[PDB]
Amino acid sequence: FPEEVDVFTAPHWRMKQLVGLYCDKLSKTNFSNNNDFRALLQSLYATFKEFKMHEQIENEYIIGLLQQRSQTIYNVHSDNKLSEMLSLFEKGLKNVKNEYEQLNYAKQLKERLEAFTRDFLPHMKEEEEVFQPMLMEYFTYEELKDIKKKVIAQHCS
Ligand SMILES: [Fe+3]
Ligand SMILES: [Fe+3]
């Protein structure tokens, strides 16, 4: 699809960049060290806050509009369980004090992140492969250009 009407590709480039970044940080983190541990969780909190913003922008500026026009999207836009990811990080930052707790938490953190990323990727793929074509049908080219402008503005501060 032409770039100027593509409402998912650039934002998803950023989200994918962020996934790569936290996967790298996760692999290098020494979970036995409290400073490494906290730094990782603070980074995750920031990243997943941006994920949360991303989904919100989509709901408000894209999906909301699309659902109003198509009338055929019955479950639509998954949730990705971001609030619960954030609550997990918060518990690590607030309740984990020593090495035993850090290493037990780490096992669960890794499992939960793997699960999230396993769902996040297909979620983004569906938007690109299913929603984008639909937008092409229910909006004019110029309408989509304007939607993209708003979407980019919200994503980029
Ligand atoms: Fe989404
Ligand atoms: Fe998305």
Side-chain angles (χ1 to χ4, degrees):
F1 297 95
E3 161 263 319
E4 67 189 351
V5 295
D6 188 331
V7 300
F8 294 112
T9 294
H12 288 173
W13 170 89
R14 167 65 173 169
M15 305 313 138
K16 288 178 178 184
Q17 178 181 60
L18 287 170
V19 171
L21 284 171
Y22 76 66
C23 285
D24 185 77
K25 186 176 292 293
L26 181 68
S27 70
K28 290 177 172 59
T29 291
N30 177 2
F31 286 94
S32 296
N33 183 277
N34 57 342
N35 292 130
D36 244 22
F37 181 86
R38 294 191 65 81
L40 171 63
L41 289 183
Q42 288 172 350
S43 178
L44 289 170
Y45 203 90
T47 288
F48 281 68
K49 292 303 254 192
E50 186 161 352
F51 289 169
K52 184 171 171 292
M53 183 195 72
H54 171 67
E55 307 300 337
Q56 294 176 171
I57 291 166
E58 289 176 335
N59 283 326
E60 178 172 4
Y61 292 90
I62 308 173
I63 305 306
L65 278 65
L66 176 59
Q67 289 177 152
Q68 293 182 25
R69 300 197 175 188
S70 66
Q71 288 175 345
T72 186
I73 325 195
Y74 296 99
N75 64 61
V76 213
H77 193 212
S78 306
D79 191 10
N80 289 333
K81 298 170 175 170
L82 290 168
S83 65
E84 125 186 350
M85 294 303 298
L86 292 169
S87 69
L88 172 64
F89 305 151
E90 176 187 342
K91 283 193 176 61
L93 289 163
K94 294 245 171 292
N95 302 331
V96 175
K97 304 296 182 178
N98 69 46
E99 292 88 344
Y100 286 89
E101 294 165 336
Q102 288 164 206
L103 294 169
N104 284 330
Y105 179 98
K107 179 179 174 181
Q108 297 178 51
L109 174 65
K110 292 174 187 173
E111 296 179 7
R112 205 26 197 108
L113 283 169
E114 292 167 352
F116 167 86
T117 70
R118 194 167 54 243
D119 284 28
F120 192 26
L121 279 290
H123 172 101
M124 287 188 281
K125 180 192 182 188
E126 182 195 358
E127 285 163 352
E128 294 162 8
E129 299 184 335
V130 178
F131 295 174
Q132 182 72 48
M134 286 181 54
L135 292 167
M136 301 295 180
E137 169 174 352
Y138 292 100
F139 295 85
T140 67
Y141 189 95
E142 291 287 294
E143 279 184 313
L144 283 190
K145 280 181 52 185
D146 289 335
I147 291 176
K148 184 189 178 181
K149 289 188 184 64
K150 297 180 181 179
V151 167
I152 292 299
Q154 294 295 324
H155 275 95
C156 303
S157 193

